[PDB]
Paper text:
Evidence indicates that variable lymphocyte receptors (VLRs) play roles equivalent to those of Igs and TCRs in the adaptive immune system of cyclostomes. VLRs consist of an N-terminal cap (LRRNT), the first LRR (LRR1), multiple (usually up to seven) 24-residue variable LRRs (LRRVs), a terminal or end LRRV (LRRVe), a connecting peptide (CP) and a C-terminal cap (LRRCT), followed by an invariant 3′-terminal region. Recently, a third VLR, designated VLRC, was identified in lampreys. VLRC sequences are more closely related to VLRA than to VLRB sequences, leading to the speculation that VLRC+ cells are T-lineage cells and that, like jawed vertebrates equipped with two lineages of T-cells (αβ and γδ T-cells) and one lineage of B-cells, lampreys may have two lineages of T-like cells (analogous to αβ and γδ T-cells) and one lineage of B-like cells.
The crystal structure of the lamprey VLRC ectodomain (residues from His25 to Cys247) was determined by molecular replacement at a resolution of 2.3 Å. The structure has a horseshoe-like solenoid conformation, which is typical of proteins that belong to the LRR protein family. Lamprey VLRC is composed of eight modules, including LRRNT, LRR1, LRRV1, LRRV2, LRRV3, LRRVe, CP and LRRCT in this order. The concave surface of lamprey VLRC is formed by the β-sheet made up of eight β-strands (two from LRRNT, five from LRRs and one from CP); the β1-strand is anti-parallel whereas the remaining β-strands are arranged in a parallel fashion. Like VLRA and VLRB, N-terminal and C-terminal caps of VLRC have a total of four disulfide bonds presumably important for structural integrity: two within the LRRNT (Cys28-Cys39, Cys37-Cys52) and two within the LRRCT (Cys200-Cys227, Cys202-Cys247). We calculated the Shannon entropy for each position based on the multiple alignments of 102 Japanese lamprey VLRC sequences and mapped variable residues onto the VLRC crystal structure. This revealed that variable residues are located predominantly on the concave surface, in particular in the region around the core β-sheet, suggesting that, similar to VLRA and VLRB, VLRC recognizes its ligands through the concave surface. A striking feature of lamprey VLRC is that its N-terminal cap has a long loop protruding toward the concave surface. This protrusion is formed by amino acid residues 41–48 located in the region connecting two β-strands β1 and β2. Indeed, ∼80% of known VLRC sequences from Lethenteron japonicum have the same sequence, NKTDSSPE, and the remaining ∼20% have closely related sequences. Crystallographic analysis of VLRC confirmed this prediction.
Numbering used by the authors: 25 to 247
């Protein structure tokens, strides 16, 4: 068995042609899948692999899905993402990766996604974020990093996000005892007026708000 028998014919997943209320959809959600099925039609616009039991994504799983605008991989058991897994996905608008077990991301993993508007990485266990990982996402409106293991963010990580409207940073063990936090502290203070949801970023996860931190003491303490 595969994902679809045709564009509008189900197999494992529910497969719909594009309609006036929905894009061309392959719905594999809630199927307890342990593997990404083959047979995902080339013109698929919306791929829902959320709420399954995927532990690995094949590196070439999404190659050729040029029309993909929506990709849901949230609520699985992903420990990592393959290098280049989202390359070629030029038309992607939404990428849902929340509620996995991601500890890290490959550099340049989002680079092809120049039309991405919504990115969720919340409820994982990201220990760090690679430098420049968001630099290509100039059309991003909403980014969710809440509930992870981030102690800091690389200098200038959000600077290319000129169209950002919403950024969630809460429930992260932010390290406000060293100089690396100053960039984050500064970004929140400067952009709380144009980007929402940032003020919940707290030192050590649940302590003093990063935004209100006294930086004079730690400005010279190297992390």
């Amino acid at each position: 068995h595969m994902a679809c028998l045709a564009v509008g014919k189900d197999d494992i997943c529910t497969c719909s042609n594009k309609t006036d209320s929905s894009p061309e959809t392959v719905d594999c959600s809630s199927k307890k899948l342990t593997a990404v099925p083959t047979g995902i039609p080339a013109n698929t616009e919306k791929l829902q692999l959320d709420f399954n039991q995927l532990a690995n994504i094949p590196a070439e799983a999404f190659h050729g899905l040029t029309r993909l605008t929506y990709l849901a991989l949230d609520y699985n058991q992903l420990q990592s993402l393959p290098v280049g897994v989202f390359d070629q996905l030029n038309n992607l608008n939404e990428l849902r990766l929340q509620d996995n077990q991601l500890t890290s991301l490959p550099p340049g993993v989002f680079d092809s996604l120049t039309k991405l508007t919504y990115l969720t990485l919340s409820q994982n266990q990201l220990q760090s974020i690679p430098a420049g990982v968001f630099d290509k996402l100039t059309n991003l409106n909403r980014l969710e990093l809440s509930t992870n293991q981030l102690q800091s963010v690389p200098h200038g990580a959000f600077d290319s996000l000129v169209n950002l409207e919403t950024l969630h940073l809460e429930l992260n063990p932010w390290d406000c005892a060293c100089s690396d936090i100053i960039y984050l502290r500064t970004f929140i203070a400067k952009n709380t007026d144009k980007i929402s949801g940032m003020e919940s970023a707290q030192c050590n996860g649940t302590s003093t708000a990063v935004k209100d931190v006294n930086t004079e003491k730690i400005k010279n303490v190297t992390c």
